[PDB]
């Protein structure tokens, strides 16, 4: 249990993460009409934009992408044993 696991990170950061992960889940909506707007960069920028609007605090993108991938693993455990 290194000192790094002492929750040195602010709780407002980890909180803003759930807000972006809660707002942007692994499912619910999948559309991107680029033919019209012609301006739609990586979705990772959408999750980072949220945390950036929280309080101008950090805005991790790789950490917010990894968190969304973890949610997909929870759905994979829905193997109906019948």
């Amino acid at each position: 249990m290194d000192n790094d696991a002492e929750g040195v990170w602010s709780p407002d950061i980890e909180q803003s993460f759930q807000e972006a992960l809660s707002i942007y889940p692994p499912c619910g909506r999948r559309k991107i009409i680029l033919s019209d707007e012609g301006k739609m960069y990586g979705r990772n920028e959408l999750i980072a934009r949220y945390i950036k609007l929280r309080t101008g605090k950090t805005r991790t993108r790789k950490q917010v992408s990894s968190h969304i991938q973890v949610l997909a693993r929870r759905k994979s455990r829905d193997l109906v044993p019948r």
Side-chain angles (χ1 to χ4, degrees):
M1 268 187 224
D2 47 87
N3 47 271
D4 242 280
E6 278 173 44
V8 61
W9 242 218
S10 165
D12 248 274
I13 315 300
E14 282 214 276
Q15 265 276 54
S16 313
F17 250 57
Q18 168 164 20
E19 241 295 33
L21 244 291
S22 179
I23 223 88
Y24 308 123
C27 238
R29 45 261 263 182
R30 198 143 179 76
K31 293 176 266 283
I32 184 150
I33 46 159
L34 242 140
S35 15
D36 217 80
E37 242 241 87
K39 276 264 99 84
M40 234 68 92
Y41 243 137
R43 243 214 301 183
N44 242 21
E45 276 165 69
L46 237 175
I47 11 284
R49 269 187 266 198
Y50 200 102
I51 16 167
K52 193 90 143 261
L53 245 125
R54 206 106 252 81
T55 185
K57 242 58 218 87
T58 188
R59 55 275 192 285
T60 17
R61 61 186 199 198
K62 238 98 142 145
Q63 243 213 24
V64 185
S65 83
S66 226
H67 200 128
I68 309 151
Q69 294 225 28
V70 192
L71 242 69
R73 293 205 282 185
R74 216 278 304 175
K75 299 160 99 277
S76 283
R77 309 215 181 288
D78 243 285
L79 215 55
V80 60
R82 314 170 210 79

Coordinates of all heavy atoms in Angstrom, one line a residue:
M1 N 0.8 -1.2 0.0 CA 0.0 0.0 0.0 C 0.9 1.3 0.0 O 1.1 1.9 1.0 CB -0.9 0.0 1.2 CG -2.3 -0.7 1.0 SD -3.4 -0.5 2.4 CE -4.1 -2.2 2.5
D2 N 1.4 1.6 -1.2 CA 2.2 2.8 -1.3 C 1.5 4.1 -0.9 O 0.2 4.1 -0.9 CB 2.7 2.9 -2.8 CG 1.6 2.7 -3.8 OD1 0.9 3.7 -4.1 OD2 1.4 1.6 -4.2
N3 N 2.2 5.1 -0.6 CA 1.6 6.4 -0.2 C 0.7 7.0 -1.3 O -0.2 7.8 -1.1 CB 2.7 7.4 0.2 CG 3.8 7.4 -0.9 OD1 4.8 6.6 -0.8 ND2 3.7 8.3 -1.9
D4 N 1.0 6.5 -2.6 CA 0.2 7.0 -3.7 C -1.2 6.6 -3.6 O -2.1 7.2 -4.2 CB 0.8 6.5 -5.0 CG 1.3 7.6 -5.9 OD1 0.5 8.2 -6.6 OD2 2.5 7.8 -5.9
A5 N -1.5 5.5 -2.8 CA -2.9 5.0 -2.6 C -3.5 5.7 -1.4 O -4.5 5.1 -0.8 CB -2.8 3.5 -2.5
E6 N -3.1 6.9 -1.0 CA -3.6 7.6 0.1 C -4.6 8.6 -0.3 O -5.0 9.5 0.5 CB -2.5 8.2 0.9 CG -1.8 7.3 1.9 CD -0.6 7.9 2.5 OE1 -0.7 9.1 2.9 OE2 0.5 7.3 2.6
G7 N -5.1 8.4 -1.5 CA -6.1 9.3 -2.0 C -5.7 10.8 -2.0 O -6.4 11.7 -1.7
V8 N -4.4 11.0 -2.4 CA -3.8 12.3 -2.4 C -4.6 13.2 -3.4 O -4.6 14.4 -3.3 CB -2.3 12.3 -2.8 CG1 -2.1 11.7 -4.2 CG2 -1.7 13.7 -2.7
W9 N -5.2 12.6 -4.4 CA -5.9 13.3 -5.5 C -7.2 13.9 -4.9 O -7.9 13.3 -4.1 CB -6.2 12.3 -6.6 CG -5.6 12.8 -7.9 CD1 -6.2 12.7 -9.2 CD2 -4.3 13.3 -8.1 NE1 -5.3 13.2 -10.1 CE2 -4.1 13.6 -9.5 CE3 -3.2 13.7 -7.2 CZ2 -3.0 14.1 -10.0 CZ3 -2.1 14.2 -7.7 CH2 -2.0 14.4 -9.1
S10 N -7.5 15.1 -5.3 CA -8.7 15.8 -4.9 C -10.0 15.0 -5.2 O -10.0 14.3 -6.3 CB -8.8 17.2 -5.5 OG -10.1 17.7 -5.3
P11 N -11.0 15.0 -4.3 CA -12.2 14.2 -4.5 C -13.1 14.9 -5.6 O -13.9 14.2 -6.2 CB -12.9 14.3 -3.2 CG -12.4 15.6 -2.6 CD -11.0 15.7 -3.0
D12 N -12.9 16.1 -5.9 CA -13.6 16.8 -6.9 C -13.2 16.4 -8.3 O -14.0 16.5 -9.2 CB -13.4 18.4 -6.8 CG -14.6 19.1 -6.3 OD1 -15.4 19.5 -7.2 OD2 -14.7 19.3 -5.1
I13 N -12.0 15.8 -8.4 CA -11.6 15.3 -9.7 C -12.2 14.0 -10.0 O -12.7 13.7 -11.1 CB -10.0 15.2 -9.8 CG1 -9.4 16.5 -9.2 CG2 -9.6 15.0 -11.2 CD1 -9.8 17.7 -9.9
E14 N -12.2 13.1 -9.0 CA -12.7 11.8 -9.2 C -14.3 11.9 -9.3 O -14.9 11.0 -9.8 CB -12.4 10.9 -8.0 CG -10.9 10.4 -8.0 CD -10.8 9.0 -7.4 OE1 -10.6 8.9 -6.2 OE2 -10.9 8.0 -8.2
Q15 N -14.8 13.0 -8.7 CA -16.2 13.2 -8.8 C -16.7 13.6 -10.2 O -17.7 13.2 -10.7 CB -16.6 14.2 -7.8 CG -17.1 13.6 -6.5 CD -18.6 13.2 -6.5 OE1 -19.0 12.5 -7.4 NE2 -19.3 13.7 -5.5
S16 N -15.9 14.5 -10.8 CA -16.1 15.0 -12.1 C -16.0 13.9 -13.1 O -16.6 13.9 -14.2 CB -15.2 16.1 -12.5 OG -15.1 17.1 -11.4
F17 N -15.3 12.8 -12.7 CA -15.1 11.7 -13.6 C -16.3 10.9 -13.7 O -16.7 10.4 -14.8 CB -13.9 10.8 -13.1 CG -12.7 10.8 -13.9 CD1 -12.1 12.0 -14.2 CD2 -12.2 9.7 -14.5 CE1 -10.9 12.1 -15.0 CE2 -11.0 9.7 -15.2 CZ -10.4 10.9 -15.5
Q18 N -17.0 10.7 -12.6 CA -18.3 9.9 -12.6 C -19.4 10.7 -13.3 O -20.3 10.1 -13.9 CB -18.7 9.6 -11.2 CG -20.1 9.1 -11.1 CD -20.5 8.5 -9.7 OE1 -19.8 8.7 -8.7 NE2 -21.5 7.6 -9.7
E19 N -19.3 12.0 -13.3 CA -20.2 12.9 -13.9 C -20.1 12.7 -15.4 O -21.1 12.8 -16.2 CB -20.1 14.3 -13.5 CG -21.3 14.9 -12.8 CD -22.5 15.0 -13.7 OE1 -22.6 14.1 -14.6 OE2 -23.3 15.9 -13.6
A20 N -18.9 12.5 -15.9 CA -18.7 12.3 -17.3 C -18.9 10.9 -17.8 O -19.3 10.6 -18.9 CB -17.2 12.7 -17.7
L21 N -18.7 10.0 -16.8 CA -19.0 8.6 -17.1 C -20.4 8.2 -16.9 O -21.0 7.3 -17.5 CB -18.1 7.7 -16.2 CG -17.1 6.8 -16.9 CD1 -17.7 5.7 -17.7 CD2 -16.2 7.7 -17.8
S22 N -21.1 9.0 -16.0 CA -22.5 8.8 -15.8 C -23.3 9.4 -16.9 O -24.4 8.9 -17.3 CB -22.9 9.4 -14.4 OG -24.3 9.3 -14.2
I23 N -22.8 10.5 -17.4 CA -23.5 11.2 -18.5 C -23.2 10.5 -19.8 O -24.1 10.5 -20.7 CB -23.0 12.7 -18.6 CG1 -24.2 13.6 -18.8 CG2 -22.0 12.9 -19.7 CD1 -24.9 14.1 -17.6
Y24 N -22.0 10.0 -20.0 CA -21.6 9.3 -21.2 C -21.3 7.8 -20.9 O -20.1 7.5 -20.6 CB -20.4 10.0 -21.8 CG -20.5 11.5 -22.0 CD1 -19.7 12.4 -21.5 CD2 -21.6 12.0 -22.8 CE1 -19.8 13.7 -21.7 CE2 -21.7 13.3 -23.0 CZ -20.8 14.2 -22.4 OH -21.0 15.6 -22.6
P25 N -22.3 7.0 -20.9 CA -22.1 5.6 -20.6 C -21.7 4.8 -21.8 O -21.7 5.3 -22.9 CB -23.5 5.1 -20.1 CG -24.5 6.3 -20.4 CD -23.7 7.3 -21.1
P26 N -21.4 3.5 -21.7 CA -21.1 2.6 -22.8 C -22.2 2.4 -23.8 O -22.0 1.8 -24.9 CB -20.6 1.3 -22.1 CG -21.4 1.3 -20.9 CD -21.5 2.7 -20.4
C27 N -23.4 2.7 -23.4 CA -24.6 2.6 -24.2 C -25.6 3.6 -24.0 O -25.5 4.5 -23.1 CB -25.2 1.2 -24.0 SG -25.3 0.2 -25.5
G28 N -26.7 3.6 -24.8 CA -27.7 4.6 -24.6 C -27.9 5.4 -25.9 O -29.1 5.7 -26.3
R29 N -26.9 5.8 -26.6 CA -26.9 6.6 -27.8 C -25.7 6.4 -28.6 O -24.6 6.5 -28.1 CB -27.2 8.0 -27.5 CG -26.3 8.6 -26.4 CD -27.1 8.6 -25.0 NE -27.6 9.9 -24.7 CZ -28.3 10.2 -23.6 NH1 -28.5 9.3 -22.7 NH2 -28.8 11.4 -23.5
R30 N -25.8 6.1 -29.9 CA -24.7 6.0 -30.8 C -25.0 6.6 -32.2 O -25.4 5.9 -33.1 CB -24.4 4.5 -31.0 CG -23.0 4.2 -31.5 CD -22.3 3.0 -30.9 NE -21.0 2.7 -31.4 CZ -19.9 3.4 -31.1 NH1 -20.0 4.4 -30.2 NH2 -18.7 3.1 -31.6
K31 N -24.7 7.9 -32.3 CA -24.9 8.6 -33.6 C -23.9 9.7 -33.7 O -23.5 10.3 -32.7 CB -26.3 9.1 -33.6 CG -27.4 8.0 -33.7 CD -28.8 8.6 -33.7 CE -29.4 8.6 -32.2 NZ -29.8 7.3 -31.8
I32 N -23.6 10.0 -35.0 CA -22.6 11.1 -35.2 C -22.8 11.6 -36.7 O -22.0 11.1 -37.6 CB -21.2 10.7 -35.0 CG1 -20.2 11.8 -35.2 CG2 -20.8 9.5 -35.9 CD1 -19.0 11.7 -34.3
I33 N -23.7 12.5 -36.9 CA -23.9 13.0 -38.2 C -22.9 14.0 -38.6 O -23.1 15.2 -38.6 CB -25.3 13.7 -38.3 CG1 -25.5 14.6 -37.1 CG2 -26.4 12.7 -38.4 CD1 -26.6 15.7 -37.3
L34 N -21.7 13.5 -39.0 CA -20.6 14.4 -39.4 C -20.8 15.0 -40.8 O -20.3 16.0 -41.1 CB -19.3 13.6 -39.4 CG -18.2 14.1 -38.4 CD1 -17.5 12.9 -37.8 CD2 -17.2 15.0 -39.1
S35 N -21.6 14.3 -41.6 CA -21.9 14.8 -43.0 C -22.6 16.2 -42.9 O -22.6 16.9 -43.9 CB -22.9 13.8 -43.7 OG -23.4 12.9 -42.7
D36 N -23.2 16.5 -41.8 CA -23.8 17.8 -41.6 C -22.9 18.8 -40.9 O -22.5 19.8 -41.5 CB -25.1 17.6 -40.8 CG -26.2 18.5 -41.3 OD1 -26.9 18.2 -42.3 OD2 -26.5 19.6 -40.7
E37 N -22.6 18.5 -39.6 CA -21.8 19.4 -38.8 C -20.3 19.4 -39.4 O -19.7 20.4 -39.4 CB -21.8 18.9 -37.4 CG -22.3 20.0 -36.4 CD -21.3 20.4 -35.4 OE1 -20.5 21.4 -35.7 OE2 -21.3 19.9 -34.3
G38 N -19.9 18.2 -39.8 CA -18.5 18.1 -40.4 C -17.5 18.5 -39.3 O -16.3 18.8 -39.7
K39 N -17.9 18.5 -38.1 CA -16.9 18.8 -37.0 C -17.3 18.0 -35.8 O -18.1 18.4 -34.9 CB -17.0 20.3 -36.7 CG -16.1 21.1 -37.6 CD -14.8 21.4 -36.9 CE -13.7 20.5 -37.5 NZ -13.1 21.0 -38.8
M40 N -16.7 16.8 -35.7 CA -16.9 15.9 -34.6 C -15.6 15.1 -34.3 O -15.4 14.0 -34.8 CB -18.0 15.0 -34.8 CG -19.1 15.0 -33.7 SD -20.0 16.6 -33.7 CE -21.4 16.2 -34.7
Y41 N -14.7 15.7 -33.5 CA -13.5 15.0 -33.1 C -13.7 13.8 -32.2 O -14.9 13.4 -31.9 CB -12.5 16.0 -32.4 CG -11.3 16.2 -33.2 CD1 -10.7 17.5 -33.3 CD2 -10.6 15.2 -33.7 CE1 -9.6 17.8 -34.0 CE2 -9.4 15.4 -34.4 CZ -8.9 16.7 -34.5 OH -7.7 16.9 -35.2
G42 N -12.7 13.2 -31.7 CA -12.8 12.0 -30.9 C -13.7 12.3 -29.7 O -13.7 13.3 -29.1
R43 N -14.5 11.3 -29.4 CA -15.5 11.4 -28.2 C -14.7 11.7 -26.9 O -15.3 12.3 -26.0 CB -16.3 10.1 -28.1 CG -17.8 10.3 -28.3 CD -18.6 9.4 -27.4 NE -18.3 8.0 -27.7 CZ -18.9 7.0 -27.1 NH1 -19.9 7.2 -26.2 NH2 -18.6 5.7 -27.3
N44 N -13.5 11.3 -26.9 CA -12.7 11.5 -25.7 C -12.6 13.0 -25.3 O -12.5 13.4 -24.1 CB -11.2 11.0 -25.9 CG -10.9 9.9 -24.9 OD1 -11.8 9.2 -24.4 ND2 -9.6 9.7 -24.7
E45 N -12.8 13.8 -26.3 CA -12.8 15.3 -26.1 C -14.1 15.7 -25.4 O -14.2 16.8 -24.8 CB -12.6 16.0 -27.4 CG -11.1 16.2 -27.8 CD -11.0 16.5 -29.3 OE1 -11.3 17.7 -29.6 OE2 -10.5 15.7 -30.1
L46 N -15.1 14.9 -25.6 CA -16.4 15.2 -25.0 C -16.5 15.0 -23.5 O -17.1 15.7 -22.7 CB -17.5 14.4 -25.7 CG -18.6 15.2 -26.3 CD1 -19.6 14.3 -27.1 CD2 -19.4 16.0 -25.2
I47 N -15.7 13.9 -23.1 CA -15.7 13.6 -21.7 C -14.7 14.5 -20.9 O -14.9 14.8 -19.8 CB -15.2 12.1 -21.4 CG1 -14.7 11.4 -22.7 CG2 -16.4 11.3 -20.8 CD1 -15.8 11.0 -23.7
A48 N -13.7 15.0 -21.6 CA -12.7 15.9 -21.1 C -13.2 17.3 -21.0 O -12.9 18.1 -20.1 CB -11.4 15.8 -21.9
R49 N -14.2 17.6 -21.9 CA -14.8 18.9 -22.0 C -15.7 19.1 -20.8 O -15.9 20.2 -20.3 CB -15.6 19.1 -23.3 CG -14.7 19.7 -24.4 CD -15.6 20.0 -25.6 NE -15.6 19.0 -26.6 CZ -16.0 19.1 -27.8 NH1 -16.4 20.3 -28.3 NH2 -15.9 18.1 -28.7
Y50 N -16.3 17.9 -20.3 CA -17.1 17.9 -19.1 C -16.4 18.3 -17.9 O -16.7 19.2 -17.1 CB -17.8 16.6 -19.0 CG -19.1 16.6 -18.1 CD1 -20.3 16.6 -18.7 CD2 -19.0 16.7 -16.8 CE1 -21.5 16.7 -18.0 CE2 -20.1 16.8 -16.0 CZ -21.4 16.7 -16.6 OH -22.5 16.8 -15.8
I51 N -15.3 17.5 -17.6 CA -14.5 17.7 -16.5 C -13.8 19.1 -16.5 O -13.6 19.7 -15.5 CB -13.4 16.7 -16.3 CG1 -13.2 15.9 -17.6 CG2 -13.7 15.7 -15.2 CD1 -11.9 15.1 -17.7
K52 N -13.6 19.6 -17.7 CA -13.0 20.9 -17.9 C -14.0 22.0 -17.5 O -13.6 23.1 -17.1 CB -12.6 21.1 -19.3 CG -11.7 22.3 -19.5 CD -10.2 22.0 -19.4 CE -9.4 22.7 -20.4 NZ -9.0 21.9 -21.5
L53 N -15.3 21.7 -17.6 CA -16.4 22.7 -17.3 C -16.7 22.6 -15.8 O -17.4 23.5 -15.3 CB -17.6 22.4 -18.2 CG -18.0 23.5 -19.1 CD1 -18.1 23.0 -20.6 CD2 -19.3 24.2 -18.7
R54 N -16.3 21.5 -15.2 CA -16.6 21.3 -13.8 C -16.2 22.5 -12.9 O -17.0 23.1 -12.2 CB -16.0 20.0 -13.3 CG -16.7 19.4 -12.1 CD -17.5 18.2 -12.5 NE -18.9 18.4 -12.5 CZ -19.6 19.0 -13.5 NH1 -18.9 19.4 -14.5 NH2 -20.9 19.2 -13.4
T55 N -14.9 22.7 -13.0 CA -14.3 23.8 -12.2 C -12.9 24.2 -12.8 O -12.0 24.6 -12.1 CB -14.1 23.4 -10.8 OG1 -13.7 24.5 -10.0 CG2 -13.2 22.3 -10.5
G56 N -12.7 24.0 -14.1 CA -11.5 24.3 -14.7 C -10.3 23.5 -14.2 O -9.2 23.8 -14.5
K57 N -10.7 22.4 -13.5 CA -9.6 21.5 -13.0 C -9.1 20.6 -14.1 O -9.4 20.8 -15.3 CB -10.2 20.6 -11.9 CG -9.6 20.8 -10.5 CD -9.7 22.3 -10.1 CE -8.4 22.7 -9.4 NZ -7.4 23.2 -10.3
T58 N -8.3 19.6 -13.7 CA -7.7 18.7 -14.7 C -8.7 18.2 -15.6 O -9.9 18.4 -15.5 CB -7.0 17.5 -13.9 OG1 -6.2 16.7 -14.8 CG2 -8.0 16.6 -13.2
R59 N -8.2 17.5 -16.7 CA -9.1 16.9 -17.7 C -8.5 15.7 -18.4 O -8.2 15.8 -19.6 CB -9.5 18.0 -18.7 CG -8.3 18.7 -19.4 CD -7.8 19.8 -18.5 NE -6.8 20.6 -19.3 CZ -5.6 20.3 -19.5 NH1 -5.1 19.1 -19.1 NH2 -4.8 21.1 -20.2
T60 N -8.3 14.7 -17.6 CA -7.6 13.5 -18.1 C -8.5 12.9 -19.2 O -9.7 12.9 -19.1 CB -7.4 12.4 -17.0 OG1 -8.2 12.8 -15.9 CG2 -6.0 12.3 -16.6
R61 N -7.9 12.4 -20.3 CA -8.6 11.8 -21.4 C -8.4 10.2 -21.4 O -9.3 9.5 -21.7 CB -8.2 12.4 -22.7 CG -6.7 12.2 -23.0 CD -6.3 13.0 -24.3 NE -5.0 12.5 -24.8 CZ -4.3 13.1 -25.7 NH1 -4.6 14.4 -26.1 NH2 -3.1 12.6 -26.1
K62 N -7.2 9.8 -21.1 CA -6.8 8.4 -21.1 C -7.5 7.7 -19.9 O -7.8 6.5 -20.0 CB -5.3 8.2 -21.1 CG -4.8 7.4 -22.3 CD -4.3 8.3 -23.4 CE -3.1 7.7 -24.1 NZ -3.0 8.0 -25.5
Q63 N -7.6 8.5 -18.9 CA -8.2 7.9 -17.6 C -9.7 7.8 -17.8 O -10.4 6.9 -17.2 CB -7.8 8.8 -16.4 CG -7.0 8.0 -15.4 CD -7.3 8.5 -14.0 OE1 -8.3 9.0 -13.7 NE2 -6.3 8.2 -13.1
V64 N -10.3 8.7 -18.5 CA -11.7 8.8 -18.7 C -12.2 7.8 -19.8 O -13.3 7.3 -19.8 CB -12.2 10.2 -19.2 CG1 -13.7 10.2 -19.3 CG2 -11.7 11.2 -18.2
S65 N -11.2 7.3 -20.6 CA -11.5 6.3 -21.6 C -11.4 4.9 -21.0 O -12.1 4.0 -21.4 CB -10.5 6.5 -22.8 OG -9.3 5.8 -22.6
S66 N -10.4 4.8 -20.1 CA -10.2 3.5 -19.4 C -11.4 3.2 -18.5 O -11.7 2.1 -18.3 CB -8.9 3.6 -18.6 OG -8.1 2.5 -18.9
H67 N -12.0 4.3 -18.0 CA -13.1 4.1 -17.0 C -14.3 3.6 -17.8 O -15.1 2.8 -17.2 CB -13.4 5.4 -16.3 CG -14.2 5.2 -15.1 ND1 -13.8 5.8 -13.9 CD2 -15.3 4.6 -14.8 CE1 -14.7 5.5 -12.9 NE2 -15.6 4.7 -13.5
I68 N -14.5 4.1 -19.0 CA -15.6 3.7 -19.8 C -15.5 2.2 -20.3 O -16.5 1.5 -20.5 CB -15.8 4.6 -21.0 CG1 -15.8 6.1 -20.6 CG2 -17.1 4.3 -21.8 CD1 -15.3 7.0 -21.7
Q69 N -14.2 1.8 -20.5 CA -14.0 0.5 -20.9 C -14.2 -0.5 -19.8 O -14.5 -1.7 -20.0 CB -12.5 0.3 -21.4 CG -12.2 1.2 -22.6 CD -11.4 0.4 -23.6 OE1 -11.5 -0.8 -23.7 NE2 -10.6 1.1 -24.5
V70 N -14.1 -0.1 -18.5 CA -14.3 -0.9 -17.4 C -15.8 -1.2 -17.2 O -16.2 -2.3 -16.7 CB -13.8 -0.3 -16.1 CG1 -13.8 -1.3 -15.0 CG2 -12.4 0.3 -16.3
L71 N -16.6 -0.3 -17.7 CA -18.1 -0.4 -17.6 C -18.6 -1.5 -18.5 O -19.6 -2.2 -18.3 CB -18.8 0.9 -17.9 CG -19.6 1.5 -16.7 CD1 -18.7 1.9 -15.6 CD2 -20.5 2.6 -17.2
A72 N -17.9 -1.7 -19.6 CA -18.2 -2.7 -20.6 C -18.0 -4.1 -20.1 O -18.6 -5.0 -20.5 CB -17.4 -2.4 -21.9
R73 N -17.0 -4.2 -19.2 CA -16.6 -5.5 -18.6 C -17.7 -5.9 -17.7 O -17.9 -7.2 -17.5 CB -15.3 -5.3 -17.9 CG -14.1 -5.1 -18.8 CD -12.8 -5.6 -18.1 NE -12.3 -4.7 -17.1 CZ -11.2 -4.8 -16.5 NH1 -10.4 -5.9 -16.7 NH2 -10.8 -3.9 -15.5
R74 N -18.5 -5.0 -17.1 CA -19.6 -5.3 -16.2 C -20.7 -5.9 -17.0 O -21.5 -6.8 -16.4 CB -20.0 -4.1 -15.4 CG -20.4 -4.4 -14.0 CD -21.8 -4.9 -13.9 NE -22.8 -4.0 -14.5 CZ -24.1 -4.3 -14.7 NH1 -24.6 -5.4 -14.2 NH2 -24.9 -3.4 -15.2
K75 N -20.9 -5.5 -18.2 CA -22.0 -6.0 -19.0 C -21.6 -7.4 -19.6 O -22.5 -8.2 -19.9 CB -22.3 -5.1 -20.2 CG -22.7 -3.7 -19.7 CD -22.5 -2.6 -20.8 CE -23.8 -2.4 -21.6 NZ -24.0 -3.4 -22.6
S76 N -20.3 -7.7 -19.7 CA -19.9 -9.0 -20.3 C -20.2 -10.1 -19.3 O -20.1 -11.3 -19.6 CB -18.4 -8.9 -20.6 OG -18.2 -8.2 -21.8
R77 N -20.4 -9.8 -18.0 CA -20.7 -10.7 -17.0 C -22.2 -11.1 -16.9 O -22.7 -11.6 -15.9 CB -20.2 -10.2 -15.6 CG -18.8 -9.7 -15.6 CD -18.1 -10.1 -14.3 NE -16.7 -9.6 -14.3 CZ -15.7 -10.1 -15.0 NH1 -15.9 -11.1 -15.8 NH2 -14.5 -9.6 -15.0
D78 N -22.9 -10.8 -18.0 CA -24.4 -11.0 -18.0 C -24.7 -12.4 -18.7 O -25.7 -12.6 -19.3 CB -25.1 -9.9 -18.8 CG -26.1 -9.2 -17.9 OD1 -27.2 -9.8 -17.6 OD2 -25.8 -8.1 -17.4
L79 N -23.7 -13.3 -18.7 CA -23.8 -14.6 -19.3 C -24.9 -15.4 -18.6 O -24.7 -16.0 -17.6 CB -22.5 -15.4 -19.3 CG -22.2 -16.3 -20.5 CD1 -22.3 -15.4 -21.8 CD2 -20.9 -16.9 -20.3
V80 N -26.1 -15.4 -19.2 CA -27.3 -16.1 -18.6 C -27.0 -17.6 -18.5 O -26.9 -18.3 -19.6 CB -28.6 -15.8 -19.4 CG1 -28.4 -16.3 -20.8 CG2 -29.7 -16.5 -18.8
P81 N -26.8 -18.1 -17.3 CA -26.5 -19.6 -17.1 C -27.7 -20.4 -17.5 O -27.6 -21.7 -17.6 CB -26.2 -19.7 -15.6 CG -26.9 -18.5 -15.0 CD -26.8 -17.4 -16.0
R82 N -28.9 -19.8 -17.6 CA -30.1 -20.6 -18.0 C -30.4 -21.6 -16.9 O -31.3 -21.3 -16.1 CB -29.9 -21.3 -19.3 CG -29.3 -20.4 -20.4 CD -28.9 -21.2 -21.7 NE -27.8 -20.6 -22.4 CZ -26.5 -20.7 -22.0 NH1 -26.2 -21.4 -20.9 NH2 -25.6 -20.1 -22.7

